[PDB]
């Protein structure tokens with residue numbers, strides 16, 4: 817968490833002409849991320865790309881997660897499509913974040929399309945994903961799809977939790 821010291825060292829090595837690499841950039845972006853200094857993280861990301869250092873799934877996850885937590889879904893989505901253009905395969909954390917973000921933003925139909933997509937690519941959904949979708953579907957009256965998803969997660973052995981049930985029972989209750 818001694819991030820200000822980390823950044824000084826970063827500059828220093830650059831002044832000395834010791835070339836930073838992906839672990840350097842990732843550690844810093846990741847740190848800046850956790851500290852909520854997202855814009856500085858993104859500036860570093862730009863610079864890294866300008867220098868030809870190739871980012872990887874950890875870098876993208878951090879930024880997408882930070883952007884998602886901040887409601888900045890359009891930029892998150894831009895990064896998501898970029899990492900795919902570069903052959904950097906998204907992971908469960910990536911999808912879970914976006915589906916969350918899109919859910920929170922009530923962009924439910926888009927959340928469901930990402931869900932469809934992640935299964936095509938063989939990324940396995942987990943309880944947070946199913947919860948987000950089932951909650952979103954339930955809040956919107958769409959109870960039969962909610963129940964389809966509920967049945968599906970049980971088939972896959974993704975075990976539902978209290979919020980899952982509470983949502984569906986709520987929906988079935990006042991509907």
Ligand SMILES: [Ca+2]
Nearest residue numbers: 894895897898
């Ligand atoms: Ca782009």
